[PDB]
Amino acid sequence: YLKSVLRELVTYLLFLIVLCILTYGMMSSNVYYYTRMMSQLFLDTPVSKTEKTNFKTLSSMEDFWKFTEGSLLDGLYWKMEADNRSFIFYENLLLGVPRIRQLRVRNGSCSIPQDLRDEIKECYDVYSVSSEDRAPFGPRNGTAWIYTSEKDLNGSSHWGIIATYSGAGYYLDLSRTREETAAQVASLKKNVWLDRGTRATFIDFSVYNANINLFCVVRLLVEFPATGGVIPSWQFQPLKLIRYVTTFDFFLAACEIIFCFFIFYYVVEEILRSFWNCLDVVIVVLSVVAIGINIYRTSNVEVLLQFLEDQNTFPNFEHLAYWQIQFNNIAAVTVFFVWIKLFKFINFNRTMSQLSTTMSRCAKDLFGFAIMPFIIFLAYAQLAYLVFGTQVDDFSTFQECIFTQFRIILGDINFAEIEEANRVLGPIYFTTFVFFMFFILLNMFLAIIND
Amino acid sequence: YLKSVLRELVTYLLFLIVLCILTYGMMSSNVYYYTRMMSQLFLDTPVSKTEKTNFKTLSSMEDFWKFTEGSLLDGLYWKMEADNRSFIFYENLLLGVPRIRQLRVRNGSCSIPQDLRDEIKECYDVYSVSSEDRAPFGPRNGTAWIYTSEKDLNGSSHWGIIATYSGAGYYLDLSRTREETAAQVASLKKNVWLDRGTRATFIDFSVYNANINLFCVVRLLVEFPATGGVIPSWQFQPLKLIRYVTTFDFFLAACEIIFCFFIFYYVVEEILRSFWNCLDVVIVVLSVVAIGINIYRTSNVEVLLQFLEDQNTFPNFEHLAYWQIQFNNIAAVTVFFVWIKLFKFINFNRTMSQLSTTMSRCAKDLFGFAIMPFIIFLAYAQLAYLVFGTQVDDFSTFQECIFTQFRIILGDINFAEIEEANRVLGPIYFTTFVFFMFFILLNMFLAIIND
Amino acid sequence: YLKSVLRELVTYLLFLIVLCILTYGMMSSNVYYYTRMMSQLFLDTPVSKTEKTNFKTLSSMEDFWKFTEGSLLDGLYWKMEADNRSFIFYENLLLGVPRIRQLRVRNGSCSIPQDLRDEIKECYDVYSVSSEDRAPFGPRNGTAWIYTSEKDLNGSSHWGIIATYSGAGYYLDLSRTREETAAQVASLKKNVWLDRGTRATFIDFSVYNANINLFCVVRLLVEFPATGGVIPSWQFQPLKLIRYVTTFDFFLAACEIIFCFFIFYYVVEEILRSFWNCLDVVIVVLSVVAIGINIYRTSNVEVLLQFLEDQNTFPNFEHLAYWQIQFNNIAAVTVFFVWIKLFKFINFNRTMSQLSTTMSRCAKDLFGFAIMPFIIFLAYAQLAYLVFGTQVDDFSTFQECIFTQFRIILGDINFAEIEEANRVLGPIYFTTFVFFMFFILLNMFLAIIND
Amino acid sequence: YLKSVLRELVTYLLFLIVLCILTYGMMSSNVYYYTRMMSQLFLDTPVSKTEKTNFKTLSSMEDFWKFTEGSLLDGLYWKMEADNRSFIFYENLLLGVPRIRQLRVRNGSCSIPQDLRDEIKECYDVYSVSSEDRAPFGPRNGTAWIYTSEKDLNGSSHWGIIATYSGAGYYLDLSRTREETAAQVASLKKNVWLDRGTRATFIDFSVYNANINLFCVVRLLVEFPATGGVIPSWQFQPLKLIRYVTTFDFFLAACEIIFCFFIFYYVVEEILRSFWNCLDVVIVVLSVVAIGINIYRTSNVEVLLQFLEDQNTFPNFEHLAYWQIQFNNIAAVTVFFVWIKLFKFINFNRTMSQLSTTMSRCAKDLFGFAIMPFIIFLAYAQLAYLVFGTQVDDFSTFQECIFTQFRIILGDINFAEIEEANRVLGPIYFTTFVFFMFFILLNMFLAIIND
Ligand SMILES: *[C@@H]1O[C@H](CO)[C@@H](O)[C@H](O)[C@H]1NC(C)=O
Ligand SMILES: *[C@@H]1O[C@H](CO)[C@@H](O)[C@H](O)[C@H]1NC(C)=O
Ligand SMILES: *[C@@H]1O[C@H](CO)[C@@H](O)[C@H](O)[C@H]1NC(C)=O
Ligand SMILES: *[C@@H]1O[C@H](CO)[C@@H](O)[C@H](O)[C@H]1NC(C)=O
Ligand SMILES: *[C@@H]1O[C@H](CO)[C@@H](O)[C@H](O)[C@H]1NC(C)=O
Ligand SMILES: *[C@@H]1O[C@H](CO)[C@@H](O)[C@H](O)[C@H]1NC(C)=O
Ligand SMILES: *[C@@H]1O[C@H](CO)[C@@H](O)[C@H](O)[C@H]1NC(C)=O
Ligand SMILES: *[C@@H]1O[C@H](CO)[C@@H](O)[C@H](O)[C@H]1NC(C)=O
Ligand SMILES: *[C@@H]1O[C@H](CO)[C@@H](O)[C@H](O)[C@H]1NC(C)=O
Ligand SMILES: *[C@@H]1O[C@H](CO)[C@@H](O)[C@H](O)[C@H]1NC(C)=O
Ligand SMILES: *[C@@H]1O[C@H](CO)[C@@H](O)[C@H](O)[C@H]1NC(C)=O
Ligand SMILES: *[C@@H]1O[C@H](CO)[C@@H](O)[C@H](O)[C@H]1NC(C)=O
């Protein structure tokens, strides 16, 4: 039994570092600053030299146009090689051409209360597929004023903060040189390309680094709720498109192929309650998903080669970016669970044999104990979402309310804005919540001390 | 017994989601940003273009006048439809006309010490109903200089941060167009409409949004303590005045009527110690209060219809705003307790039968244990209020002192200003407090471990 | 026994609220903002209109002179009644005349290493009574350039942040009007009144409020370590000098006299281990000290009456301010202990009879348990003071190091500057400290669980 | 046995304060501000008068040159004695001459993917000893353009934040007067001395204070990752070079010599498991290392005397600085352990005899218990490093990830940027992590309660 356990043990052991190698391998070291520099160059810089606001600060259409005609242009251009080629920082190819896309909602999408109909001329509803405006508004001279479809326009429907956004919409592709772009943008500002009915806009472009080999894909996402104002959001994604430069990369490629053999091996083992079975399956399921993504999704790299043919177009990476994220997402989770699988054998046989007997024993009862606090914990969350959420960003969404309470329990708090929101309940809420939580838990010890 | 318990159970179950529907229904999703944009447009913007202060920063009369003649004007006007109609952000009707009101205290309200009487000419006491100045000061040409009564002037006495303020006072109603208003304001600054004896001022106006159907009521409240300086405060209240637009709204209306039947049903059940009885009554009491507010208070909507007749006046919503707050306040609390009522049945019968037996058992003793820390906890609070409260905002009020200590226990702290306040006791206070609290609790475990 | 205990009980009860009345009585409500406005007017305002620094920011002599010739002047003057009388905010008498005093250290106070003697001409040692420079430097035309003694110059030696400072030194008294003062200050800047050897400067003045009856005493304390630079510090003290205006004040006066009778009563009771005896004595001792301060120290009020004769001089309140602080300090502590005396009787007889038996029992052992962590806790404190304290303000002083660790345990942390200080030990220090502390305590439970 | 234990006890006792004296002695009091003033003068000041960025803010080459030609120059010069001698603050000798050094990487150090070779002309790899560029680029007129070796150029290879940096490189030594330096710097900017291939630059200079006797050594370290941008870092080190000024210093010198006798005494005692043996050895080992550093490393002081001959050169203290740090590092650790050695005797004999019996008993089992959380704690750390670390600075390095989680557990958190990084996993990560950690620990109590 021991040697058989030892075999599945050492097999697991090899499988460990192999994955650890891939992770450590597939992740370059200094990538962070590559983002941070990009981010600070765009997000963090004053909209205009005379302006005190960053991109994170944009409150208005005027704010937006300033930014577009502002640092964004200067952020995307340098002198400096073609000279149509502009190296960012001097170190970064601006890859292809940037693209701007917006969304628009129809006039009569909404309805005016009968009393104010004599007053109000028209309204514009919150964005929806139904409320989508496909009419060719404006001079209709270009894709800016001409509607297109996410089928026709290669792209993936994106999930925004207030709503999901279909890839389709009104878009425009920029120019190679800063001057030509400004000419385009000006017309887009001159003629009104941002009107009452424009809910969300996209600015997307890709950037390549030649020093280390990586691709920076940038999604600048600006929303315009029916309430007006501006909600800026951004995405900076590094990507490794070309897997082969160094032999070390080729060294990793063999590993992944070898890594596939392990999974192939474990899959057979899965054939036949149990908890660790329920645990082990999770590891395998995630594993398969990654590779499938890794191959028939990510290994495509068509758009690249397609872009490599003619580099004057827009190199849509949104999918490729989107997926490798999920890939990075999944793979990370696997490793996490991979470390967890360590316990069942090396610890249970000797060390935690005196623990698991207590651990798994109470683990059944722990379910019964933990029932009480959540309901209470959820109640405040629901309460706070009702009282607050019209006031404090932290309570804006019911989800974030839950998250906020953890920060509260851990001590991260903005108390002032709470008291500003409600001079009465908020303090009461804050106190009672914190108060009961301890008082609640202390009882649970006792019913645990029952044993 | 079980089926009878099952009936009161499923009955409770239906009553749950019905309320959940109403809450989820009566609360729109994106309302938060509607406030946030409004707030950031007023509270968060520089008083003047050359000025570095926000509305939250106002320290002086000069600060105030700048703000009034500053962003406030520009915040209330846009171009843009009448053109007397100015859409905020282009998306928001400025509803009716804004109104400014101030309070004033009589000359001899206070008394000078005999020694300095030769020095000081006059004083002005802290605001009170007695100290109220009803004399028609100044040119006496308008409501600005003419006192009016909260009976005559429709309004609700408001509860400020240092004091309650009667609705009566000296007020002025603005104009439709920004220019005419500035003319008014200038005269109010030219002639001195803010003098030694002006304790508190009000700026109130309402804003309607046509996209989603809502009303933003704004209370800008500025105080002037007898000590001078300025204490800014603000209120941004969304309101749903017209309950019927979508059929979904009509769907909710039937629910509330149906919802009333439940309460009517439970009221009869209340007829006849007990804790859960003491619990259940609370649910019912709050429930009734809400609906009464919901009907003969809020459903009035007279001022609206009154305003809808002639829109050039000031549409006082202060009550309507004030109440629906309380309504939102109460309803939220109900839901909270509604979730709590879950425990007594589903959990007690099976799961917490092994818990409630311990829970309710120690719940009696917990009262005896918890006595010790509060007295100690209160002592520091009272101590801190004596030592501090002349120094640190967090200790300014005895109430907030209590709240401050929680942040301290949870770790939210400004230590510097404390040490700045008192280089000696504060650190001692801070250390000892934190120190004993743990040391105190640890003992309480033992007397609990006694069982 | 019970009635006898009941008598000492109700006697204690009356004594409670009597003190509570005095405290609540002797403390006015809104005093806080009176300070806050004063503070924000001076500490918080830009040194110059073109300048971005506050008084808290001053790094240099130039910084200082700017401040003096800057906001300070404008902060002390308004238009506005005499007109030699300038009401601050229009609400506050500038009381008497402000005063500036500095300290100076002799040339050869220090000694140069023999190697650099050929290089360096002279040095100036850290401030000390020995290093004090009494020589009449400069043009010697005024108290600015003429040394005076704290005996001759009425004043109390003050305890600064790096050192205690004798009241004696070089001082100058300002003028009534802003213009005349600037003339003085300019000469003090024109001629060099701040030289290499000036360690510390004082700016002190008093301000009276006529609305509520109070006195604001302001100590602006600037230090110049031998290392150069500037360490600003400030003191804003409210004072109630005239105890009699309202009959309510007279109502309080009788109480304090009545309050004295209680102490007189308890003193006799003290005549005769015990803990509560050791407790009770503390209450009495502090009590006596307060009244003695209250009478033959504070009730003096001579300087006032002296100032009231001729108001053109400097009204030194430093003592009067200094003492009532200590008075407020002591009285607060008393109340704290007063609440503590509640336990021994009402709780011990019924409620905590089941607690004190455990409480006082383990209270002996708690001493033995708590020994271990302090030594460890102190060690890190001493360690951190060695590693840090040349880097992080929080560790600058060994005292503050201790305080810093509490914030760390409670979660208030600046981690960045720590890692900036030492990329190695700091993180190690931080981790290990936090780590052991929990690990340490958990053991202590067990030896407590021993019972 | 007791007297023998008493002898080793009192011997230890004397050894305690002797060290305490040395520490307290070897550390001057006010040193902190000496740094803080220096730091704030350089790190904290706007690059240019019109500029809003500090040295900590530098994002670019342009940023850098501005700083060099900016505050740095003004920070290093004052008027003021020679006049070639410029006293900083007027209180600080600029010691010798400052020095600037940079690093450079060869052209073909890296390799371009075959597809973009037609596009990209050249790349520059991340810094390495191999990638080092020793070619004499540029006009080759000076050490700026002429490569030198760390053998030839006296210096110690320094450990930077992204990489270790050999002392060798391209350097330049500044002038005595600000004007001459600017002439040098301009040429270095005029001609391009910062190119694509410059990874890291050094600015190093020393500053002496004559008031207290100390030396400030300044290392300004700027990095340029292959990704572009700028990573500023700084080091401000006080040093006591001349050990003899006051007799008190001579008093300390005898102590250290006497202090050596103790160690000499304890070394013999070490001759012969045990834990305290394992403890005691550590104390001795560290002790020896310090003195060896103290003598044949630090007591050298040659460069000083060498510099004292001719003061126009660059006084390299980098080693002397580097070592005394380690010295201060080690000595601090010793004291920490010195306090720890207290327990084994005074506490074990009487007080903790009732504790150590429990302490050391469970101390064996504690190892078994603590196994579970670390693996879990590490997992999140590894997970977070995979998910984050491309986004959040706090997760940038796997090491800092661990540190970040402590702040999270203690409550120090930036939640926003996390949610900004990943709208999904981050919140999930945050919640689950915090959630399990408590849930994990609670079980461990039970298996501990097993006893
Ligand atoms: C929107 O529809 C309303 C409804 O008749 C109409 O009055 C208004 O002119 C329309 N505006 C636009 C821009 O389509
Ligand atoms: C559409 O018409 C406008 C009106 O002159 C013109 O400025 C714009 O360039 C036209 N668009 C295109 C794509 O030609
Ligand atoms: C989508 O990709 C195809 C592939 O050649 C291309 O022809 C087409 O123009 C693309 N459509 C876009 C980018 O909207
Ligand atoms: C206020 O009353 C005092 C008391 O006589 C008087 O001297 C002063 O002129 C009055 N001022 C005003 C503005 O009423
Ligand atoms: C009151 O008189 C002043 C003095 O000219 C004048 O400016 C103001 O307009 C008058 N008020 C009204 C309401 O007419
Ligand atoms: C109060 O409301 C009534 C209702 O018509 C109106 O006539 C009156 O002018 C109002 N008073 C105010 C707004 O002061
Ligand atoms: C200080 O004393 C030194 C010692 O001789 C002397 O050289 C220097 O001139 C003196 N300076 C002043 C200002 O007294
Ligand atoms: C001292 O002499 C200077 C030199 O002119 C003069 O400016 C100053 O006013 C004099 N001081 C006094 C108090 O007269
Ligand atoms: C101290 O007070 C006495 C009291 O009259 C006064 O004569 C003297 O001038 C004062 N000395 C000062 C303020 O330096
Ligand atoms: C770098 O090497 C490449 C490879 O041939 C060459 O094309 C380029 O001109 C070189 N540039 C420099 C600055 O050495
Ligand atoms: C190297 O040549 C340049 C070109 O004129 C000159 O400016 C520079 O001063 C020279 N360097 C030295 C050290 O002479
Ligand atoms: C290293 O020190 C020696 C000692 O005299 C000196 O001659 C040489 O110039 C120094 N080299 C440097 C500072 O690069």
Author numbering:
A (entry chain D), B (entry chain B), C (entry chain C), D (entry chain A): 216 to 295, 302 to 493, 504 to 682
Task: Quote the original article.
ADPKD is caused by mutations in either the PKD1 or PKD2 gene encoding PKD1 and PKD2, respectively. PKD2 shares an overall architecture with other TRP channels, i.e., six transmembrane segments (S1–S6), a pore loop between S5 and S6, and intracellularly localized N- and C-termini. An extracellular tetragonal opening for polycystins (TOP) domain between the S1 and S2 helices contributes to channel assembly and likely participates in recognition of unidentified ligand(s), but whether and how this domain is implicated in PKD2 channel activation has yet to be determined.
Overall, the F604P mutant shared a similar tetrameric architecture and domain arrangements with WT PKD2. However, the F604P mutation resulted in a kink in S5 and a displacement of the bottom half of S5 below 604 F/P, which leads to expansion of the activation gate that likely underlies the GOF phenotype. Interestingly, when comparing the PKD2 WT and F604P structures, the S4-S5 linker was shown to exhibit a notable conformational change: the N-terminal end of the linker in F604P moved outward, which led to a dramatic displacement of the cationic residue R581 that is normally conserved in the TRPP family. Here, by directly comparing S6 of PKD2 WT and F604P mutant, we found a transition of the π-helix in WT PKD2 to the canonical α-helix in F604P mutant. This transition in PKD2 induced a combined twisting and bending motion of the distal S6 below the π-helix, resulting in twisting and splaying of gate residue L677 that expands the pore from 5 to 7.6 Å. In contrast to the dramatic changes of distal S6, the proximal S6 above the π-helix remained rather stationary in PKD2, suggesting that the transition from π- to α-helix alone is sufficient to induce pore opening and channel activation. The twisting motion in PKD2 not only induced the gate residue L677 to rotate and point away from the pore center, but also resulted in turning of the precedent residue F676 towards the pore.
